[PDB]
Write a protein that binds this DNA or RNA. Sequence first.
RNA 1: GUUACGGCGGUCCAUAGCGGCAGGGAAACGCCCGGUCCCAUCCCGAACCCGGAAGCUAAGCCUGCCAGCGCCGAUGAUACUACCCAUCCGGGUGGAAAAGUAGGACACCGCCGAACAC
Length: 182
Amino acid sequence: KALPRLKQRYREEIREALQQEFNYANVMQIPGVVKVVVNMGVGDAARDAKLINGAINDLALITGQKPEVRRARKSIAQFKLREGMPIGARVTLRGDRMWEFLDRLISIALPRIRDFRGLSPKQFDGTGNYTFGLNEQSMFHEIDVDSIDRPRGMDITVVTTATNDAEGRALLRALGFPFKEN
RNA sequence: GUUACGGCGGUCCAUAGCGGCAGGGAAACGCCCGGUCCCAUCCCGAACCCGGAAGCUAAGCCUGCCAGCGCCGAUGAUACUACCCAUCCGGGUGGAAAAGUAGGACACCGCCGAACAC
Ligand SMILES: [Mg+2]
Ligand SMILES: [Mg+2]
Ligand SMILES: [Mg+2]
Ligand SMILES: [Mg+2]
Ligand SMILES: [Mg+2]
Ligand SMILES: [Mg+2]
Ligand SMILES: [Mg+2]
Ligand SMILES: [Mg+2]
Ligand SMILES: [Mg+2]
Ligand SMILES: [Mg+2]
Ligand SMILES: [Mg+2]
């Protein structure tokens, strides 16, 4: 009875546009976004685990889902890290949660991006993938700026079903992220 | 009986794998649609589980073709060696490799269950 505007968009207009613009043999060659990944590894828990709790608090308030933290999958003396210390916080999505969060992000954080300049095609990998790292956490609405103690990191990435980068870029710009003009 | 079907199985388990190419949705197979109730995410219906069959075979699977690569492999010879030898010095009979070579080769088969025919 309730469902996200991007879900509808995908069903009716994005799918039709991509089909027309690439002449797929079948309807569903249309790649579809698979997983929005939201993790973080500070690397500072090796000296103090207090900041990890705050980062997870930010992740929970941003998502409402309870992020996990992983240990030192290997151990490195140079990084002063031993296996078993928690360094990486994760929080994942799927489906309606994926696209509600994506709509909120596109509507709020992107126009809210200080000195926003658009994102380039070239950080793809040719297989329809898209991932990079957030300047600052404070960009988000539900988070409180008066309570942020130290500027820490967040990431909410997107992925595709695209076989190559061509379809990935086509559908992604159809969704309408701010690609550069070069 | 046929089948361009699904499970379980075999086999001194790659002649049976990998790679590229083409094709399959009647049923079955996958993907698939949504999470009140079972159940699960060290979060997520991603995994699993559950309700249903709107859609499609792209992925995966299958089958068919390709020698690009894996792969099997002669005869012959060579290496090797059991025994015996001749005043060292290597031969006589027996055994006979590895690699390389012509080539072979894009599995075969069993029991049930599904669509066409009797
Ligand atoms: Mg993709
Ligand atoms: Mg049918
Ligand atoms: Mg789901
Ligand atoms: Mg296909
Ligand atoms: Mg496939
Ligand atoms: Mg071999
Ligand atoms: Mg082979
Ligand atoms: Mg012989
Ligand atoms: Mg003797
Ligand atoms: Mg002699
Ligand atoms: Mg031989």
